Amino acid sequence: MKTGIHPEYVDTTVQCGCGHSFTTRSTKQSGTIVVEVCSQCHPFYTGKQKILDSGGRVARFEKRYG
Amino acid sequence: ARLVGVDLPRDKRMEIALTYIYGIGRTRSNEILAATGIDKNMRTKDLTDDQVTVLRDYIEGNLKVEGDLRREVQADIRRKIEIGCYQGLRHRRGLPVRGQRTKTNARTRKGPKRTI
Amino acid sequence: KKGPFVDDHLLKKVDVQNEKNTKQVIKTWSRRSTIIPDFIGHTFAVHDGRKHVPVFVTEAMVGHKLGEFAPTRTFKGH
Amino acid sequence: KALPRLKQRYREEIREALQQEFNYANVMQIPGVVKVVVNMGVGDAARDAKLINGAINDLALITGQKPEVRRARKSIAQFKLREGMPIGARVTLRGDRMWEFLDRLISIALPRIRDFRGLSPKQFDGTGNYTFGLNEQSMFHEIDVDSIDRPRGMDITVVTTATNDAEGRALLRALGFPFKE
RNA sequence: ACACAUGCUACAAUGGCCGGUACAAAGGGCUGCGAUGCCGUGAGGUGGAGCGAAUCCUUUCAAAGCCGGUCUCAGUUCGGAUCGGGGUCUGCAACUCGACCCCGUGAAGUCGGAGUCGCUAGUAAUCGCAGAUCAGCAACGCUGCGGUGAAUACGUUCCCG
Numbered sequence: 210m211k212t213g214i215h216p217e218y219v220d221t222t223v224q225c226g227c228g229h230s231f232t233t234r235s236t237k238q239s240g241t242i243v244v245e246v247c248s249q250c251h252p253f254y255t256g257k258q259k260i261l262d263s264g265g266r267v268a269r270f271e272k273r274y275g
Numbered sequence: 276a277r278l279v280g281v282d283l284p285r286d287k288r289m290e291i292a293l294t295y296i297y298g299i300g301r302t303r304s305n306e307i308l309a310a311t312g313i314d315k316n317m318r319t320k321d322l323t324d325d326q327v328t329v330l331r332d333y334i335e336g337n338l339k340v341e342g343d344l345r346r347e348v349q350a351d352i353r354r355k356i357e358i359g360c361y362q363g364l365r366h367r368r369g370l371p372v373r374g375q376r377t378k379t380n381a382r383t384r385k386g387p388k389r390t391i
Numbered sequence: 392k393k394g395p396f397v398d399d400h401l402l403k404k405v406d407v408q409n410e411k412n413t414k415q416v417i418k419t420w421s422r423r424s425t426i427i428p429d430f431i432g433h434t435f436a437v438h439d440g441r442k443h444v445p446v447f448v449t450e451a452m453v454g455h456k457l458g459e460f461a462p463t464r465t466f467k468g469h
Numbered sequence: 470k471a472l473p474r475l476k477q478r479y480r481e482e483i484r485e486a487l488q489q490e491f492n493y494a495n496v497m498q499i500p501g502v503v504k505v506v507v508n509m510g511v512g513d514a515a516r517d518a519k520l521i522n523g524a525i526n527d528l529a530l531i532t533g534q535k536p537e538v539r540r541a542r543k544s545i546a547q548f549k550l551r552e553g554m555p556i557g558a559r560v561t562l563r564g565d566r567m568w569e570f571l572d573r574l575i576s577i578a579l580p581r582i583r584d585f586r587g588l589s590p591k592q593f594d595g596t597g598n599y600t601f602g603l604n605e606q607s608m609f610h611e612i613d614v615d616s617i618d619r620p621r622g623m624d625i626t627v628v629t630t631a632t633n634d635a636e637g638r639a640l641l642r643a644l645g646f647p648f649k650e
Numbered sequence: 651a652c653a654c655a656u657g658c659u660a661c662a663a664u665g666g667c668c669g670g671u672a673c674a675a676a677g678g679g680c681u682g683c684g685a686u687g688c689c690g691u692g693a694g695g696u697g698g699a700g701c702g703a704a705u706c707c708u709u710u711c712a713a714a715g716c717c718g719g720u721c722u723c724a725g726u727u728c729g730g731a732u733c734g735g736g737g738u739c740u741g742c743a744a745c746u747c748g749a750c751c752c753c754g755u756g757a758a759g760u761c762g763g764a765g766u767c768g769c770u771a772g773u774a775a776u777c778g779c780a781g782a783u784c785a786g787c788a789a790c791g792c793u794g795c796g797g798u799g800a801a802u803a804c805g806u807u808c809c810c811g
Contacts, residue, residue, distance in 0.1 A: 342584025
């Protein structure tokens with residue numbers, strides 16, 4: 210590592226809304242990150258919703274209901 | 276502030292700050308801000324991250340947004356352009372779909388002008 | 392949003408077609424309804440006035456009225 | 470902290486389970502991340518002189534390294550190039566910088582991108598290296614979202630000791646990196 | 651793919667949006683106009699008071715106006731085209747081709763080159779209202795009704811008849 214050219218590299222404490230907390234080295238001067246994302250990926254859920262999204266024959270039978 | 280995926284501005288009221296997302300206009304802002312409880316007069320600088328939490332969970336839970344709406348529609352337009360409809364033909368040729376005037380106006384579908 | 396149309400002549404013909412499990416090209420006058428999903432699979436010779444165009448009906452056709460899987464106007468420009 | 474967190478779990482769990490999955494029969498044979506290099510874009514060289522210092526600054530404070538400015542091998546005429554113009558810098562990460570960058574992006578950068586469905590498993594080379602595209606930026610909470618006028622994108626490469634490709638799929642699957650069949 | 655012509659909505663603060671509130675004129679109505687009430691977010695649905703109408707219905711009728719709050723000059727709380735989903739009504743039937751409502755979507759457009767048009771007082775300008783045709787409507791059209799309401803005319807040299 211060279212001395213003076215690299216930015217300061219500090220410990221941090223990352224917190225999400227649910228409180229699931231992370232401790233890392235980082236570049237932030239604040240020493241913390243107040244984030245809205247945790248290790249709760251929505252791809253698993255988003256993908257399911259997207260898969261669920263198609264199919265309209267049923268919807269038509271919906272309007273017509275007999 | 277940050278929300279569902281739209282970067283909120285510096286100084287806007289909440290019933291306008293919610294509007295900058297693809298799924299929300301003015302009326303959805305007047306119904307979302309009535310259901311959740313955030314004052315519509317609140318600026319974006321004065322917004323709370325817990326208000327981002329409750330508001331965010333509400334409007335991803337009970338309403339659809341950017342990716343759903345867009346690759347969402349854009350699956351319905353390509354749906355009617357695959358099956359061979361007449362509105363499919365209008366989306367093919369680049370013409371107005373509602374069967375409206377094509378002789379003089381409907382320049383917003385043909386676009387920029389070439390003159391012969 | 393209540394009782395949708397139905398094309399009663401095509402309705403009588405369609406039922407006969409699917410009871411016997413027979414599929415036949417149909418010269419059809421009707422431009423007005425693809426009413427039930429009972430019409431799925433039947434080939435419709437749609438009549439734009441001048442000739443009959445064969446149209447296969449699949450699951451996505453439900454909710455599009457029958458005539459404009461065949462267009463009535465012709466345009467090229469040059 | 471004796472071990473970075475990703476490496477805290479890597480030094481026991483992913484290695485023991487990856488031996489479970491593949492019977493190399495030899496310790497030591499057992500893939501791990503070598504470097505994480507972060508190529509940088511631009512292509513505005515010749516067209517605009519000022520931005521590349523925007524990219525030097527950009528690579529830095531996403532991770533804390535001074536990106537080394539990498540320039541043109543040759544002047545190729547159509548896309549205005551000139552031998553020796555700066556066209557994007559890159560930063561090579563290895564060790565504590567590699568792992569702290571990885572865990573942070575993993576638990577921070579990947580979830581935020583709008584409509585972030587996943588990452589393709591297909592994007593390997595012949596030998597187990599994974600590269601994917603960050604089109605805009607501001608996936609990172611290190612960059613303040615009003616400091617940032619135009620979006621500077623970047624490639625991020627993970628380079629492993631994976632002699633195959635499903636070796637690297639298996640590592641980067643067990644390591645907390647997303648994918649989507 | 652185009653080019654012309656008459657209109658309408660605009661490009662914002664003399665403005666937009668929310669709340670409160672005051673004032674018209676004329677008209678229209680039988681297999682028509684249809685109230686209170688109830689169901690809807692809203693087009694509307696259910697129901698039929700009462701009227702062939704200075705009586706009943708079109709609500710006691712308006713909108714611009716006034717009082718108040720918010721927005722702070724920005725491609726925006728300007729602008730509504732377009733497009734997606736979801737509906738209602740009319741009709742045997744809304745695909746080619748109806749209007750209206752709801753949710754989203756949110757483009758051009760920063761007062762407009764040469765040229766050119768209208769208007770001399772309740773006029774111009776702007777604001778709603780009704781009617782005929784009509785089951786429904788392409789009505790921003792046409793014919794009318796009223797509301798608020800200016801500037802300028804030195805004068806025949808010049809253009810037009």
